[PDB]
Structure 1
Amino acid sequence: SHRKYEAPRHGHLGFLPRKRAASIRARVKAFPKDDRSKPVALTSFLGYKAGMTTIVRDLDRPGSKFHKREVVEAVTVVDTPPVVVVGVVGYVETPRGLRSLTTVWAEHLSDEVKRRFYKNWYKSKKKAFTKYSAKYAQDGAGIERELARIKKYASVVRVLVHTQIRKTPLAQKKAHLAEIQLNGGSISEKVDWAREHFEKTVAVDSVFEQNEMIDAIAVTKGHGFEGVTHRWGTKKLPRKTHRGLRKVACIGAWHPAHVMWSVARAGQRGYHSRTSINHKIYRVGKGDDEANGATSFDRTKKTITPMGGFVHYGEIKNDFIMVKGCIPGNRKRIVTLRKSLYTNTSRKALEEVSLKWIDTASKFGKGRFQTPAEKHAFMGTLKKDL
């Protein structure tokens, strides 16, 4: 017989399987559609999620009850030191999809980017791209040929880049290597751009501009094996339930004589690849700049890093992006910032955002002070400060 009372199904069947992602670093499954008229531009950047903080800004929404009024908003800080271009990839389109015909690398490769190719780096002869470097060191001995191949073929061109893990305060020393598609001009122009930027370091401001609506692609936080009650948000069984209550009671009918794929079951929760769209860039801050967290209303010489540093992460001594809201992934995790795949107006994407105040109080508890100057101003002299 039918369900006695209708209720919506628990979970989303389009996010299946709820398995562990293939790696820490989530790849861009699709890049923005190419337009030849626009200049050659990177469509993505790589950052490391440092933490969240608070901003206060004057909202400009003509018709909301909070029009021209201060609003407090959560933001995510992504530490984005400039990424190095090392190599490019050309994709020829075939009746079976895009196929990479060749990959040309740079002359010299960074130690972190070869640590990427290694696993037992210390017990290694570091023989990596040595014969490729020998193939290099001339004008076009074996490199202009590969570039000309990518120009003659390979309607899609992607540049191989890597992160500066050494700049970023983690303990990894192993750069993250990825591709970013060049989405402007001709294939020849894209190859020219890649050649010019070989071994060159691109900063986040060149690709991402303030008040942009971008996407974050990252692997969400892992939570191990989970029961169905939390993994799917099913109703808990009544208290007097023999053999357990954090379960799904009926996992199927008698017929079909199988458990269906759409029935909620226990297993891994989190550590999934996610692509979350329409996050507004609130600030693109420069690393070589004190008063990073200073705006036109606050004007205090303070940096984005909270008092005592970002929890579990550290400091933001590099360039950073402050995006509105939350993003997939946890702190210390590599995230990919991708340009929007469509032109969104929404009257809300177009909203120009001026930050009036950035929180820098300690996140390691209930911090009352933004700067050590303000802390000392409030608390005067301590016994330890003779």
Structure 2
Amino acid sequence: SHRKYEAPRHGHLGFLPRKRAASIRARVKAFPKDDRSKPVALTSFLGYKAGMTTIVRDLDRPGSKFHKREVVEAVTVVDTPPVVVVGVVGYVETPRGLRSLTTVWAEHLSDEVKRRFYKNWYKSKKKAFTKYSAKYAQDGAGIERELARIKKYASVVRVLVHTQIRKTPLAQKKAHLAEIQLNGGSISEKVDWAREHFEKTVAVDSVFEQNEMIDAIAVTKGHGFEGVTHRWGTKKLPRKTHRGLRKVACIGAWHPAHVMWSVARAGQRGYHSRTSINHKIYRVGKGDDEANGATSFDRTKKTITPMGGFVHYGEIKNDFIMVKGCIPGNRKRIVTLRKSLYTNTSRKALEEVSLKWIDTASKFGKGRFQTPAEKHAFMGTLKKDL
């Protein structure tokens, strides 16, 4: 008989299976549609989630109860040092989909990216790309032949880039290598851009700008095996329930005489690939710019790094992307920031945000001070120093 009281199902069947992602770096499964009139540019970027903080800004939203008023907003900081271009892949269209025709690599690959090709780097003889780099012996005839093939074919061009983890506080030391689609016309010009940028760095400001809507693609934080109550949000069973209450009472009707795929079951929670869209960039800050965390309203000469450092991450010393709100993945995780797949004109996008103040109080507690100078000014002289 019927359910006797209607209620929406628990969870989204489109995010199935709730299994562990096959990689710690979530795949970009779609790049922006290519507009072959614009200049050649990366469609995405690689960064590392540093942490969260809060900003204050005046809201520019006519008709709102908070128009021209100050609002406090959570922001996520993504450490984004320049990525190194080390390769270029050509993709030909086939009746079976896109197929990589060939890949041309840079002549010199740094140990950062060479470590990606090894499970035991320290005891290896580090032979990776040693025979390939000889293809640049005298004139690079083989390299130019492969690039000519990419131009003659390969309706889609993607560059191979890798992060510079040595510039992050992470202990990993093994770089993240990814394909980023080159948008901007003239497949020939895409290949020329890739070849010229071989062994060269691309900074995050050449890809993203202030107020832009971007998408964050990352593997969520892992939580291991989870019961249905927190994995799917099902109702806790009553206290009187024998055999436990963090369960789904009826996992199926008599017929079909099978548990169905749509029934909440205990299993892995977290560590899933997610692609969350429409996160507005609030800052495109630069590592070389001391007073990274300053605004035109604050002027306090401070970097984005909170007092004591980003908890479990470290200090931001590179270029960084501050997006509004939160993004999937935990701190220290590699994230991919990609340009929006559509042209959003909604007055939520297209809003020009100007930060008034960025919180740099310690996130290791109820941080009361923005700067060590401010802590000294409030507390006066202490016994050890100050």
Q: Secondary structure at the match of 1:285?
A: coil
Q: Secondary structure at the match of 1:291?
A: coil
Tell me the number of residue pairs that the alignment of Structure 1 and Structure 2 aligns: 386
Question: In 2, distance between residues paired with 1:35 and 1:70?
Answer: 38
Offset at 1:361?
0.2
The C-alpha deviation readout for 1:185-215, integer Å capped at 9, x for no partner, is 1110100000010000010000001100000
Q: Is the 8 A contact 1:226 1:268 kept in 2?
A: yes
Question: In 2, distance between residues paired with 1:317 and 1:77?
Answer: 12
Q: Is the 8 A contact 1:360 1:371 kept in 2?
A: yes
Q: Is the 8 A contact 1:48 1:80 kept in 2?
A: yes
Question: In 2, distance between residues paired with 1:373 and 1:112?
Answer: 37
Offset at 1:138?
2.8
Q: Secondary structure at the match of 1:225?
A: strand
Offset at 1:375?
0.1
Q: Is the 8 A contact 1:228 1:264 kept in 2?
A: yes
Offset at 1:27?
1.2
Q: Is the 8 A contact 1:107 1:137 kept in 2?
A: no
Provide the TM-score with structure 1 as the length reference: 0.99
Q: Is the 8 A contact 1:218 1:334 kept in 2?
A: yes
Question: In 2, distance between residues paired with 1:72 and 1:269?
Answer: 31
Question: In 2, distance between residues paired with 1:54 and 1:117?
Answer: 39
Question: In 2, distance between residues paired with 1:348 and 1:123?
Answer: 53
Offset at 1:141?
1.8
Consecutive unaligned residues of structure 1, counting only runs of 5 or more, are none
Pairing of 1:213-362 with structure 2 (within 5 A): 213-362=213-362
The C-alpha deviation readout for 1:106-149, integer Å capped at 9, x for no partner, is 01001010100011000000001000011113323210000000
Question: In 2, distance between residues paired with 1:139 and 1:197?
Answer: 18
Question: In 2, distance between residues paired with 1:112 and 1:62?
Answer: 49
Aligned-residue Cα RMSD (Å) equals 0.6
Offset at 1:353?
0.3
Offset at 1:13?
0.2
The C-alpha deviation readout for 1:235-291, integer Å capped at 9, x for no partner, is 010000000000000000000000000000000000000000000000000000100
Q: Secondary structure at the match of 2:281?
A: strand
Question: In 1, distance between residues paired with 2:112 and 2:118?
Answer: 10
Q: Is the 8 A contact 1:26 1:274 kept in 2?
A: yes
Question: In 2, distance between residues paired with 1:330 and 1:153?
Answer: 40
Question: In 2, distance between residues paired with 1:93 and 1:137?
Answer: 32
Question: In 2, distance between residues paired with 1:56 and 1:347?
Answer: 19
Q: Is the 8 A contact 1:210 1:282 kept in 2?
A: yes
Question: In 2, distance between residues paired with 1:180 and 1:241?
Answer: 53
- Please name the residue that 1:55 is paired with: 55
Q: Is the 8 A contact 1:86 1:199 kept in 2?
A: yes
The C-alpha deviation readout for 1:216-237, integer Å capped at 9, x for no partner, is 0000000000000000000010
Question: In 2, distance between residues paired with 1:362 and 1:198?
Answer: 40
Q: Is the 8 A contact 1:287 1:319 kept in 2?
A: yes
Q: Is the 8 A contact 1:280 1:349 kept in 2?
A: yes
Offset at 1:81?
0.3
Q: Secondary structure at the match of 2:141?
A: coil
Offset at 1:60?
0.5
Question: In 1, distance between residues paired with 2:385 and 2:238?
Answer: 59
Q: Is the 8 A contact 1:215 1:339 kept in 2?
A: yes
Offset at 1:100?
0.3
The C-alpha deviation readout for 1:154-186, integer Å capped at 9, x for no partner, is 000000000000001100010000000001111
- Please name the residue that 1:122 is paired with: 122
Consecutive unaligned residues of structure 2, counting only runs of 5 or more, are none
Question: In 2, distance between residues paired with 1:228 and 1:139?
Answer: 62
Q: Secondary structure at the match of 1:179?
A: strand
Question: In 1, distance between residues paired with 2:83 and 2:140?
Answer: 26
The C-alpha deviation readout for 1:264-320, integer Å capped at 9, x for no partner, is 000000000000000000000000010000000000110000000000000001110
Offset at 1:35?
1.2
Question: In 1, distance between residues paired with 2:295 and 2:327?
Answer: 24
Q: Secondary structure at the match of 2:284?
A: strand
Q: Is the 8 A contact 1:213 1:280 kept in 2?
A: yes
Question: In 2, distance between residues paired with 1:35 and 1:138?
Answer: 37
- Please name the residue that 1:204 is paired with: 204
Question: In 1, distance between residues paired with 2:183 and 2:367?
Answer: 45
Question: In 2, distance between residues paired with 1:102 and 1:138?
Answer: 22
Provide the TM-score with structure 2 as the length reference: 0.99
